[model samples]
Target: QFEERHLKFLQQLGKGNFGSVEMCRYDPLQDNTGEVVAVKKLQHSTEEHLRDFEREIEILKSLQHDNIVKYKGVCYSNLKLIMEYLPYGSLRDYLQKHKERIDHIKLLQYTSQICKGMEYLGTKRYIHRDLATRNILVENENRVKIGDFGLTKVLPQDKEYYKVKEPGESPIFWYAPESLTESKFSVASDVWSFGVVLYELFTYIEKSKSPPAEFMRMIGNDKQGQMIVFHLIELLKNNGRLPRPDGCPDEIYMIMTECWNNNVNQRPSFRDLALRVDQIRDQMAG
Candidate 1:
């Protein structure tokens, strides 16, 4: 039950292959007026798309946490979703902009918030198959919120592994080795992605400031730079090890290593990871 009059579309925020997101000023004819929001509109809508949208809405509606992106409502007629708009944009965008200048406290803050959100998702028996910095949003003061539930899946409590019918569509760089090889997903796999995001967050400092020749070589591919990154992931897969980010703290790097453990069973649960991160933050604060 959404109406065009409810929002004054301002400008296009982002566009994807299947949809576009716009910034709007929402005046719902109530006390809460002039609030800015993001309106995501899907193109080429189909029955299948609607079903997926409903499932996403179901999950989003259930999630209620400070670290999770707040969902407003949906407009079924136009396949549009209204959501909280973060002025700082996605974590990836923020990192790209301030990687060289971002303080360690801000980095840890975002990391901890992400872990907190993912921990909640774990308690709900949901696996975010596509966990990445780009899927996380940032608000004022570097507050982070997990977003983009498009690839989320609900798993039965009886089993840890959820097999994918189709494989190879997701980004290769962020996937666990088992997920890359077996088409199976779990909280452990999401942890693996979190480790990658950790690496990305820390490594951005180096990559942003006059990337080394070797680093540049690794990403020397087509316009999208997908192929080179995929190649690097292949190397890591074959070696059964993720490259550690330079200058990362020993404690944090240890946690990252634990997350990237080849044996899924060896990975720490999200709750454990969150506690560890909290401890690290405390130490950093002290």
Candidate 2:
């Protein structure tokens, strides 16, 4: 049981329309100083929103993996969630700050960690619709974990496609072609996003700049930006596949090529993806 008395708020971490997050300390006392934590709270929320928030907590409570963010507990009355404090913050910020200094080995190592985390999610039948660098949290010493489960869905084993009603809500570039066209989502589609993430990870390209600058030049919006953007994306898919990131290793980029395969069935499963990343790790070690 968590109480306000047990938690001491430290500083404001972040804020959005829904609520704000703050750095906090969980003091158990008993001759032990409390550990750092991040508390996410809802603001001006209704019962329905609270229920949805509780569902997120339920999902987090059920998930326990090293590569997944650790959920501590909830402050029910305030609709606040206590989670592990990642010192390094998001993977995107980490990479952007150290882009020049991050070596091939380190980047691949982080990529492998992401694959391991997503592989765990795949086995659990959870499709993280949003799997980009920003959602990935990094701890000290380059340890990475998949965080931010707002768009995560627990799909039935037999379901082939999960629809995304609001296409504009998610990152367009990270989504698969099928997802963009039909709003259909699956583990395979997530693999496509993984490849895009790899591109972002290696190329230092921010996902906010979708379809890449080169692709954007070919795609323009005369009226509705969304309409033309999708059209450009479709054209790019039909025109030619995403070009290989400059200076990426041949073997590693080959795995990415398979990941971006137009056919969903052709993409490697998360398990296979992890295996390939492991192989790359081994190769680098030798």
Candidate 3:
């Protein structure tokens, strides 16, 4: 078993609610040759946090795809999780970092990569409750991986959607109508979030979060604590979709709107979305 003692800390990569991701040189062989891996460790080290970390580890272990982050192994004694190191960081930041160099078709290619991973999750009945460009990891400009399994859930074999106990606690802007209104999460809602990711990509992530106060008076909501959610829902229902990003091709924006469709049943599946993006990327003008 790989132990935390064998990891020589290189540097801290980033931090989240669970813990921090740090770069480490892991030497299992102890023969001087090893690989650099990102290690996720608990900050609090409490039972609650450990359970959550363990859950994430299990989910990562179950998923294997080119577009999904690779899980190396875990050191249970110290609760250190080793994963594939992605040097470029999150897609949202990456887009902003390389905005001047990344072109239209490249963005579409990223969309297809994400969709392919989402397609696999759908087959596994796994719901990535939070699907956004911010959560996606960029291995390189061309290689992307679906990551951040903190809010992930595996749907029951017979069930299509998982019920969320809390609604607004999640990223409200990336949610679908059914998710925001009824707290239900399905592959459809994930697709909806993917569309929002499209918006982030097309705009170089300038519109990732449309904050609560940006829209409404919260009519009919009545201080229900869900006022913002309902207003956002109604706003989206009224075709108040985000405007096409500057220089974003019409076809790509069309896909984004299709993802934001009010009729959850009408949204394209990840498999279909991948093919669509692939085709659209090929059809793009120079």
Best by TM-score: 3
Checking candidate 3 for backbone clashes, the offending pairs are: none
TM-score for each model: 0.84, 0.86, 0.87
Point out the higher-scoring one by lDDT: 1 or 3: 3
50: Cα error in model 3, Å: 3.2
Better of 1 and 2 by TM-score: 2
Q: Model 3, 54: alpha-carbon shift in Å?
A: 2.0
What tens-digit string does per-residue lDDT give for candidate 1 at 71-113?
9888755677888898988887788887666877778888889
> How many backbone clashes does every candidate have?
0, 0, 0
Window of ten residues with lowest summed lDDT in model 2? 214-223
Candidate that scores best on lDDT: 3
Give the runs in model 3 whose Cα sits over 4 Å from its true position. 28-33, 166-168, 207-226
lDDT of 2 by residue, 180-207 (tens): 7787888898999998788777776555
After superposing candidate 1 on the true structure, give the runs of residues whose Cα lies further than 4 Å from its correct spot: 15-17, 28-33, 165-168, 205-234
Deviation in angstroms for 51 in model 3?
Answer: 3.0
